[PDB]
């Protein structure tokens, strides 16, 4: 008297894989069209480290709108830690940065259906994992592009309101520029005359002493 089995806890694994896997040529065309010029079929098929590090940085800055430099900056708190004693060494640097980059990808991919991003994907990338991850990314980008018309009313309201600031700020800089020019050009007509008057009296004095 045996009992059946629900294999499809792997449907949940397929569920973790709900986003579509894109063919190599289509995946790259879409990635390039998102203005990631660095992405190529050749490099992505044989991923190397220091290439993936550069390429990954470009991707994160676009979808997150942040500065990697600012990221390096925030890792190094200016004051408040360890200032009295150096402990004599520049070590831990970059190692912490490498794990922080790992975390950034991990959190993002959790949001788009990938739960197991890890250091191999960054530092010894492999073809199937690489295309799987990027296909989830593209599907997310397409969803964002596709659904971007949901927010156009907000954009239009924002553009109206931003227009009022700019129009008001344009008037302010125009008015403040025009008055300073007007003042000086009148003063030039007077400044010429002021030198003229000292000159006139000085010549007349030549024949009075």
């Amino acid at each position: 008297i045996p009992s059946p089995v629900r294999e499809k806890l792997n449907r949940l694994s397929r569920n973790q894989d709900v986003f579509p896997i894109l063919d190599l040529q289509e995946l790259v065309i879409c990635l390039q069209s998102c203005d990631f010029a660095l992405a190529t079929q050749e490099n992505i098929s044989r991923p190397t480290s220091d290439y993936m590090v550069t390429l990954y940085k470009q991707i994160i800055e676009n979808f997150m709108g942040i500065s990697v430099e600012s990221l390096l900056n925030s890792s190094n708190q200016e004051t408040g830690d360890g200032h009295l004693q150096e402990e004599n060494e520049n070590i831990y640097l970059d190692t912490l940065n490498v794990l922080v980059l790992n975390k950034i990808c991990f959190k993002f991919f959790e949001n788009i259906g990938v739960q197991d991003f890890n250091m191999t994907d960054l530092y010894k990338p492999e073809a199937q994992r690489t295309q799987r991850l990027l296909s989830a990314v593209v599907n997310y980008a397409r969803f964002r592009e596709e659904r971007m018309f949901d927010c156009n009313s907000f954009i239009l309201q924002m553009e109206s309101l931003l227009g009022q600031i700019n129009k008001l700020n344009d008037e302010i800089k125009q008015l403040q520029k025009d008055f300073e020019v007007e003042v000086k050009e009148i003063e030039a007509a007077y400044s010429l005359l002021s030198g003229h008057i000292n000159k006139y009296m000085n010549e007349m004095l030549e024949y009075m002493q």
Binding site: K184, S191, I197
Partner: protein, 113 residues
């Protein structure tokens, strides 16, 4: 670019305007004036051997010419005068040697004649 320093130039205007007034203070003729008050003018003589000619009155009614080079006693008069009037005037320039005395007396003789 000049401004606000006008008080410096204002001082120059007020100073120069009044330096002008000092230099241009109206010098009086002192000769047109003296002739106007006294009806007495000093002109060169017609006969330049006798240098100085004196004209009395508003018109050419009375006049006389005198050398005034040294001991100047020259007889000459538009209203003719007797020798006695001419001798007294000739002594004031000779035995008195006073120009001022000779001048006041001469005009009295001429205007009355």
């Amino acid at each position: 670019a000049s401004i606000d320093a006008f008080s410096d130039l204002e001082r120059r205007m007020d100073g120069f305007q009044k330096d002008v007034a000092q230099v241009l203070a109206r010098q009086q003729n002192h000769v047109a004036l003296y002739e106007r008050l006294l009806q007495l003018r000093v002109l060169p003589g017609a006969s330049d051997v006798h240098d100085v000619r004196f004209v009395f009155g508003d018109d050419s009614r009375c006049w006389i010419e005198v050398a005034m080079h040294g001991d100047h006693v020259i007889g000459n008069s538009h209203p003719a005068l007797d020798p006695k009037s001419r001798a007294t005037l000739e002594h004031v320039l000779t035995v008195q040697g006073d120009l001022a005395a000779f001048l006041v007396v001469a005009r009295d003789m001429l205007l009355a004649s």
